Design a protein around this ligand. Structure first.
Ligand SMILES: O=C(NCCn1ccnc1)c1cccc(F)c1
Ligand SMILES: O=C(NCCn1ccnc1)c1cccc(F)c1
Ligand SMILES: O=C(NCCn1ccnc1)c1cccc(F)c1
Ligand SMILES: O=C(NCCn1ccnc1)c1cccc(F)c1
Lengths: 237, 300
């Protein structure tokens, strides 16, 4: 069934599962033509496939060549997503394949179910949570590898850096969702918060700065402030 | 013109013969139905006055034998029977007619309704789907379940309709996932019409059979089957032009015959709105769309 607040700790048990977010697969800029009509120009996208227990991120880069000569691209993008997720699962050893795949948008349910007919024991699930994974392209190193790609490519990351050495996966997911929620509500402010201090650096093999435990508490508090704030500047409260 | 004789009518019952129905009072002198048109399958069906639960009945073709109805006080229902003694059966029927104890199948000369509802329904094909092979006629009731329900439980007392499942490996060619799910022509034309049914006549036959079971007995599994077979055609971009023209006539007469007060239960808003207004065939069912819009505009 659907994943929600009630069954939230199921994400951190020992059944392998993946979140799949398709919101950055088909990306366009809208512009005017010389004749004054409107047209789209596609830019590179990505599938965001994430193990919430381990932090392993399978980032499949979607190069704009995949759209050449195709019609109904928003519909195709969902099926392309399902094709790539199915290919990923088939590439994993049996003991690494997920028992469940949770899609962040319900329109991915039928495309993924059909592509996974060969895997009747893998549950395809929606969610009632409004997760902020669309903001993945606000993470500078992820955006950089997507925009530089000249061909289809899969790149592997750990979106938790080394956090699991010090915190649990429940706590790591909560920090991730807070950071991504902030970047989604006000990207400039969020990024200022994260980088304001030039003495805290991002290691070459990491995505986020190397905050101490105490500095993470300060950071997380500032992100909460921002989200409520902008929730003020938005609704005037 | 053939005859279905009754031993007697011991319990009060609403009897139905094809699209007609009449009431027989408890111990009313009644000996059957005469003047039944030869050349069509027929269904004789029953609803007891005391328990409107369980409509039940019998599909039969008078060309295949001499059938009579006998009420069984142990099993509590009217049972169809075969009398192999033709000489004795003919003598009984003649005796009943002379006594004017048979209701007349009341067909209007102008009226092609029953033909139009049963054009491709075949009895031998019906027997293939209800395997009580010892009898030439087939029993159906409101409660019988289909194999699709069985997957989710008595295999002998079930309707084995052809299984249709749009999210199945039979329906979806490896590597054509999007193509085959959004345009079901492969599944309609290759899998079902060329590989299972053999021709469209058989496809229409099972579709007509599923509707009539859904309508006369409120068989949920029959209603599901009827809607599934319509949707498979409407969801195919490539359908033989003669098939679409015939489907429009088939559905027209089914909608025309449907009791107005049962539409809420026997019509599925999603299938019909998709078929008439979104599907590939949204412009190909003119007669069906006209009668649906004039008779059931609420559903849409
Ligand atoms: O065996 C039968 N028993 C019931 C018939 N019956 C009623 C009055 N005298 C006999 C049967 C066989 C052929 C035709 C038929 F109407 C019924
Ligand atoms: O229809 C006749 N018998 C069939 C019985 N029946 C049951 C329900 N409606 C009719 C019939 C008509 C008039 C007089 C008569 F002796 C017989
Ligand atoms: O051809 C039919 N079903 C396809 C499966 N089948 C059954 C027997 N041989 C193949 C069929 C079923 C019921 C009524 C009807 F007129 C046709
Ligand atoms: O309307 C029907 N089902 C959908 C609503 N419903 C009712 C009970 N369970 C679900 C329906 C029920 C029985 C026979 C039939 F042909 C249709």
């Amino acid at each position: 069934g659907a994943m929600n607040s009630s069954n939230y700790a199921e994400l951190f048990n020992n059944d392998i599962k993946l979140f799949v977010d398709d919101t950055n697969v088909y990306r366009v800029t809208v512009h005017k033509t010389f004749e004054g009509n409107v047209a789209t120009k596609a830019i590179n996208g990505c599938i965001f496939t994430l193990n919430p227990k381990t932090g392993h991120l399978f980032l499949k880069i979607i190069h704009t060549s995949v759209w050449a000569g195709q019609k109904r691209l928003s519909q195709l993008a969902k099926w392309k997503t399902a094709e790539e997720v199915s290919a990923l699962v088939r590439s994993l050893p049996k003991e690494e394949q997920p028992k469940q795949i949770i899609v962040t948008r319900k329109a991915m349910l039928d495309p993924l179910e059909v592509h996974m007919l060969d895997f009747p024991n893998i549950a395809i699930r929606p969610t009632e949570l409004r997760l902020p994974f669309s903001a993945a392209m606000s993470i500078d190193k992820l955006s950089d590898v997507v925009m530089k790609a000249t061909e289809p490519q899969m790149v592997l990351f750990n979106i938790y850096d080394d956090w699991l050495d010090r915190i649990s996966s429940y706590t790591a997911f909560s920090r991730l969702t807070l950071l991504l929620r902030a970047l989604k509500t006000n990207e400039e402010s969020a990024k200022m918060i994260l980088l304001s201090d030039p003495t805290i650096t991002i290691k070459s093999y990491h995505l986020w700065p190397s905050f101490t435990d105490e500095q993470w508490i300060t950071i997380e508090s500032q992100m909460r402030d921002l989200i409520l704030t902008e929730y003020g500047r938005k609704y005037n409260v | 013109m053939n005859t279905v004789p009754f031993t007697s009518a011991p319990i009060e019952v609403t009897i139905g013969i094809d699209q007609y129905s009449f009431n027989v009072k408890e111990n009313q002198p009644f000996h059957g139905i005469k003047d039944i048109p030869i050349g069509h399958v027929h269904v004789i069906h029953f609803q007891h006055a005391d328990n409107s639960s369980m409509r039940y009945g019998y599909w039969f073709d008078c060309r295949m034998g001499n059938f009579y109805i006998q009420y069984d006080p142990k099993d509590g229902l009217y049972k169809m029977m075969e009398e192999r003694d033709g000489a004795k059966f003919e003598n009984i029927v003649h005796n009943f007619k002379e006594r004017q104890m048979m209701v007349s199948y009341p067909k209007i000369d102008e009226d092609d309704t029953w033909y139009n509802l049963t054009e491709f329904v075949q009895m031998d094909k019906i027997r293939k789907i209800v395997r009580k092979d010892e009898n030439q006629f087939s029993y159906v009731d409101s409660s019988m379940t289909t194999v699709q329900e069985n997957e989710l439980s008595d295999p002998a007392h079930s309707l084995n309709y052809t299984v249709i499942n749009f999210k199945s490996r039979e329906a979806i060619r490896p590597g054509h996932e999007m193509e085959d799910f959004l345009d079901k022509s492969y599944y309609l034309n290759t899998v079902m019409l060329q590989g299972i049914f053999k021709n469209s006549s058989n496809y229409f036959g099972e579709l007509q059979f599923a509707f009539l079971n859904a309508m006369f007995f409120g068989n949920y599994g029959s209603s599901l089957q009827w809607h599934a077979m319509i949707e498979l055609i409407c969801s195919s971009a490539t359908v033989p032009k003669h098939m679409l023209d015939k489907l429009d006539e088939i559905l027209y007469y089914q909608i025309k015959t449907l009791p107005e007060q049962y539409s809420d239960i026997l019509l599925n808003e999603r299938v019909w709105n998709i078929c008439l207004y979104s599907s590939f065939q949204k412009n190909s069912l003119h007669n069906t769309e006209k009668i649906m819009e004039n008779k059931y505009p609420e559903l849409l």
